[PDB]
């Protein structure tokens, strides 16, 4: 169900949302067990955090000491879980297009931290949740309308035997060459050259690289752009752009921080 | 006392005692008897020094935290020195 459609009935239910990750926080430490050491007698005890509250011992546990207010929290001997917060956007595909997409914060925990990155379209399955937020951190006073977030429990994005069987074929050069773009005219010297570009060479660290670089010349009135489009789909981690008016810095890296351009 | 020149003053103390143990049981006068007793009191005291108890006034109530630490050593001493 859509992000725009969540309502107060959902507030304790499990839900599942499709959306786009805009960005994430770094990992945030969440205390799961507090560690209290006695200033008088150096005895130590452990307290599990209950609903975000430290159940502090008011007097020292040891009956032979039993001093009040003598326990103190030894921060780096407490035990911590991992938490991360991610801004998940309603996709521009699903919006009523005259107005903005929404977004929702989600909390993701432990080894589910860093399961996704900016630009990932994902599903997230989790409990819908709501919490109050303080009017001033110096006070208990809370604002009437709660903050909402989804507290996730699962995420998802959006062998060699077969490979060996094909490897023995005699037509394999042409077989792989046709496969890159069977919808386009067969042009198989171009397709074979691109196939070698997809294979690549090897590397040596003592400089050189195992790259391959190709230029499709010829008229503007031919299918080479469509070949490029299919190769951009085929490759695992490529990019597509065009060179007219392409800045030396826009293509490469641009300015505070420096951000990578298309080629990088 | 324990550290300085591997505590050579300890041998000074026993030598001071030895210089009345040499003479006869009777020849140790009341002053010699007292001197040997004072040497023993020296060794006893050097054993006996120990960190003091942190002793607090109880008229005024405790704050929201107790005593911050019981450590009563001076800054140039570690407990292993003692």
């Amino acid at each position: 169900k859509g992000m725009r459609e969540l309502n107060p009935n959902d507030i304790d239910k499990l839900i599942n949302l499709k959306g786009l990750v805009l960005r994430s926080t770094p990992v945030i430490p969440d205390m799961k067990v507090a560690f209290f050491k006695c200033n008088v007698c150096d005895h130590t005890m452990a307290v599990e955090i209950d609903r975000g509250v430290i159940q502090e011992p008011a007097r020292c546990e040891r009956i032979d000491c039993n001093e009040p207010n003598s326990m103190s929290l030894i921060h780096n001997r407490c035990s911590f879980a991992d938490k991360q917060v991610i801004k998940l956007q309603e996709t521009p595909d699903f919006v009523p297009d005259g107005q903005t997409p929404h977004s929702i914060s989600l909390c993701v925990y432990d080894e589910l931290v860093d399961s996704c990155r900016a630009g990932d379209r994902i599903e997230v399955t989790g409990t819908f949740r709501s919490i109050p937020i303080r009017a001033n951190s110096r006070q208990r006073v809370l604002k009437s309308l709660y903050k909402t977030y989804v507290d996730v429990v699962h995420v998802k994005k959006v062998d060699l035997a077969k490979i060996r069987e094909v490897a023995a074929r005699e037509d394999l050069y042409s077989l792989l060459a046709r496969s890159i773009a069977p919808s386009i005219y067969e042009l198989e010297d171009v397709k074979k050259g691109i196939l070698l570009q997809l294979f690549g060479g090897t590397n040596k660290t003592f400089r050189y690289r195992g790259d391959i670089n190709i230029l499709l010349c010829g008229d503007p009135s031919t299918s080479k752009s469509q070949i490029l489009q299919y190769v951009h789909k085929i490759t695992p981690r490529g990019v597509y752009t065009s060179g007219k008016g392409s800045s030396a810095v826009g293509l490469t890296a641009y300015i505070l921080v420096l951000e990578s351009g298309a080629l990088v | 006392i324990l550290s300085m020149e591997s505590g050579k003053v300890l041998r000074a103390a026993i030598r001071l005692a030895l210089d009345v143990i040499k003479i006869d049981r009777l020849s140790r006068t009341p002053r010699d008897n007292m001197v040997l007793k004072l040497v023993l009191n020296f060794f006893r005291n050097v054993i006996a020094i120990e960190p003091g108890e942190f002793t607090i006034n109880t008229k005024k109530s405790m704050p929201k935290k107790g005593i911050t630490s019981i450590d009563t050593l001076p800054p140039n001493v570690s407990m292993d020195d003692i």
Binding site: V40 | E53, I56, T58, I70
Partner: peptide
Amino acid sequence: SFKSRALNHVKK
């Protein structure tokens, strides 16, 4: 005299 209480490291 000053009413007071003694806290001892040896019971640590």
